[PDB]
Amino acid sequence: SRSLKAMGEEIWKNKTEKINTELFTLTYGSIVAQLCQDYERDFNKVNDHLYSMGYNIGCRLIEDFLARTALPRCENLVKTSEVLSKCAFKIFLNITPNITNWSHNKDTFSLILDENPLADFVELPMDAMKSLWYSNILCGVLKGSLEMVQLDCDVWFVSDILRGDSQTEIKVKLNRILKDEIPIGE
Amino acid sequence: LPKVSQSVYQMLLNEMVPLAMGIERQISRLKIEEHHTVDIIRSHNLIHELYKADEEEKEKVLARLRNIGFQIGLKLSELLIFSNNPNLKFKEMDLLLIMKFICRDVWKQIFGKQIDNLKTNHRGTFYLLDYDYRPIQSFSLEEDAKNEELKMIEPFLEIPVGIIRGVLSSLGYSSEEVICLASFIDRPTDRPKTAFPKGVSFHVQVT
Amino acid sequence: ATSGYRLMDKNYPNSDVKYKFDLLKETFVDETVFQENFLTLTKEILSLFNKCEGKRQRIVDILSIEIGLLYYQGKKYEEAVSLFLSCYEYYTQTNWNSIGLKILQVFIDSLSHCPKLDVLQIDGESVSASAVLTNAFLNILKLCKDNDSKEIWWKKFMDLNIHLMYPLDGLFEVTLNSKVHLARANVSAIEVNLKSYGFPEDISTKTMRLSLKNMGGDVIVFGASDFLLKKGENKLILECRDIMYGEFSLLSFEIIVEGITFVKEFPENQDEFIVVPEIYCKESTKVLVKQAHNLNLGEYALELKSVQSDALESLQVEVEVQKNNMKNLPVSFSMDEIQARKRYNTPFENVRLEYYLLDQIT
Amino acid sequence: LRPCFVSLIDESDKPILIYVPNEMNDVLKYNVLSNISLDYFESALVEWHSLDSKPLLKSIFQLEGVSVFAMLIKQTGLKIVIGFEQKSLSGADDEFEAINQIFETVRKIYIRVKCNPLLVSGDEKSIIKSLERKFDELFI
Ligand SMILES: *C(=O)CCCCCCCCCCCCCCC
Prior knowledge:
Chain D: Required, together with the TRAPP II subunit TRS33, for TRAPP II complex assembly or stability, and for proper Golgi localization of TRAPP and the Rab GTPase YPT31. This is part of a larger assembly, with chains A, B, C and D. Helices cover 45% and strands 13% of the residues of chain B. Chain B is of the alpha+beta class. Chain B is globular. Chain B has 7 helices and 6 strands. In chain B, the strands form 2 sheets. In chain B, strands 4-6-5 form a 3-stranded antiparallel sheet, covered by helices on one side. A two-stranded antiparallel sheet of chain B has the order 2-3. Chain B has helices at residues 6-14, 17-27, 43-52, 55-84, 95-110, 147-153, 158-168; strands at residues 3-5, 30-32, 37-39, 126-130, 178-183, 200-206. Helices cover 23% and strands 28% of the residues of chain C. Chain C is built from 6 helices and 21 strands. In chain C, the strands form 7 sheets. In chain C, strands 3, 8, 9, 12, 13 and 14 form a 6-stranded mixed sheet that branches. In chain C, strands 4, 5, 6 and 11 form a 4-stranded antiparallel sheet that branches. A 3-stranded antiparallel sheet of chain C has the order 15-16-20, with no helix packed on it. The longest helix of chain C has 19 residues, at 32-50. Chain D is of the alpha+beta class. In chain D, 36% of the residues lie in helices and 19% in strands. Chain D has 3 helices and 5 strands, in the order ββαβββαα. In chain D, α2 runs antiparallel to α3. β1 of chain A pairs antiparallel with β1 (3-5) of chain B. Palmitic acid binds at residues 58, 61-62, 65, 71, 73-74, 80, 83-84, 88-89, 92-93, 137-138, 141, 145-146, 149 of chain A. Palmitic acid (PLM) binds at residues 58, 61-62, 65, 71, 73-74, 80, 83-84, 88-89, 92-93, 137-138, 141, 145-146, 149 of chain A.
């Protein structure tokens, strides 16, 4: 019907309610703050628990995304990349991550977050300078949502601007495209 | 100024009671992330667990969630004061101005609708009355299970209690002379009937 | 600008432009009269400000300390020290660190200069000059954060007595590393670490005691005597000779340096209680109490055994019962009277202690 | 315009931070000036803004050849005090607006640091470090 970029811009313009980014930052920061507080700053497992958060929320969010866009099922990483680059992030967080690091045989790629609205202003302590990610909810959402389009994916963080690296990257390697089910009867 | 889709924000805000139980169960389904197996338990199961867990577990989880809401209010209030700049003073001219500021600004910028009329004893406690309470407009169990429905929602009502408690903090009064309690005693008096049947009331007292 | 006579330390931005401030060359013709002219002006300002109720009080204190510093510059320290007694320590709780450093440094120097300075009074009972001087000294130690250049005050005071407490916090901080474990025959040991970031030099302590309080109320002390604290992070073992077993809550930690005692009283009800278990060692004198093995019907008794008895200079072992009904003593070590205690004094290998059941207790 | 010192004080007269953007004993002079300026707020001598609900800058006094201005945050009780050299001021309206802009930037930095969602509850050392590095980034 239309290009993915045009679809994303059109739906974001006049087909969605809106809320201030700063409030979203405060909410997510308070969540991470409480997680940090009551785990005794054991930052190895807060990552996993935020991953569980992301899986849970994105596994519902995929229904809203598909109900809005009504796209067909994705089949290969080439078109999936186009989708979650140029519509899916635009509808929700109003950003357009770039695609780079195309691995061999088009197996994996990486999302470069030019702007992360989850960390608009953040300064981690020295304890978390090389232990915490603070954005595990994003890749958790990605894994949870892509699980529901019938494709299993391994997604994790490579770098983050908060930790001091040059850019924030999320490798979204695919493991196997699981097939549909069938109801036999014996 | 930049914005985010309201749906994802609402879903994140709702997914705190599942946090509030998952975290506590971790202190006191399985899948491999990349090399190590992490355990995840579904969000809808944890709310049912909170309904039927314990009297002392529930109090701990509610206190934790109130602390979360307190952080929301504490961080949010300074930003609203810098942005909108109300005609308040620090400690106390009158509580009516403070509550008017909360109603006119905080609930605008958190939820999509101004909070409705509020009672006033002029001496002690104030009642903040909201009809249909946006973040639970699509919560239900069954056609017949109505008491179970209401008793299953109550932990979700700690987010605004914490928000109000935080907003009162950093504005004079600390969290020792302020007590706030949410309840479902409100009625749908004459408004059009929405999905959820019962309103929300915040009995908030200061001294 | 025209003369250059410095007033304490306050200097202005040195501008090349000069001012011919010559017509009033009557009140500062010499160097001496200038100081008391400034003092007169400042006193007039102080009197006017002090007649403004209590709505303007900070500038009053600033002007008073300015008067004190001028007195210090004039070398008439007897008035200066008395003037500083009012705000002796005031500018240290409110986080005005440079102000406190300046005022308290000049106070200590003034006290150290004059010959006698035997006795002083601040708001009541006449406090000893040395007793307040050491308080001020120990205050500048924690107040002055300059790492290595605080050694000047240390060298000033070592060459320079009342058993005197202080709030240890701000000088030392201690945390519990690991927990209790047997170290020798009958002494339970616990290792701890204390960081000495306050003082610059090593400390020759005299006694170190860590107190653990039971839920009942009684306490046990883990001791360590004559330990030389090094400048930095150091670990040490605290030994307790007389121990009790069960849950225990930390109470306080005490440093006893020669003349002073630094105490750090912990908060209450932390729910971080540590447990003092029994550790069995083959070479450890102990006494075992239990019901007797061989006995007649209706003839109760106890058996006391002394494992690793061997040679012992002396020992006093006492056994006393507790009442249950909270007003019944359901056992007696005598057929006629009602006793609740036995007191052995001499060494033994095995003895038989009598028993007389009172009513029904099992 | 390079300020001489920047002081932040809360409702309880607790100085958060009196950063000086680095001679040695000028910090004492600036701390004395901040202490003198602290009591100047609650005084009938100066009429504060109390008009249209906007923070208002004021020239509070001149001691030791240091033009020092201050702003009061009515809603929070925060107090900002900023000093300047006499020889660096031309007394122009645009300069007044620039000083107001500097005050606004300092307030924004303070809010951003305070609303950081990793401050535990009240750890003052972290606030001092963060504000100090931010002020180093700005005033340079
Ligand atoms: C083919 O249908 C693939 C569809 C693309 C995957 C769906 C991506 C949805 C999640 C995007 C991230 C939203 C923000 C989450 C953080 C709150």
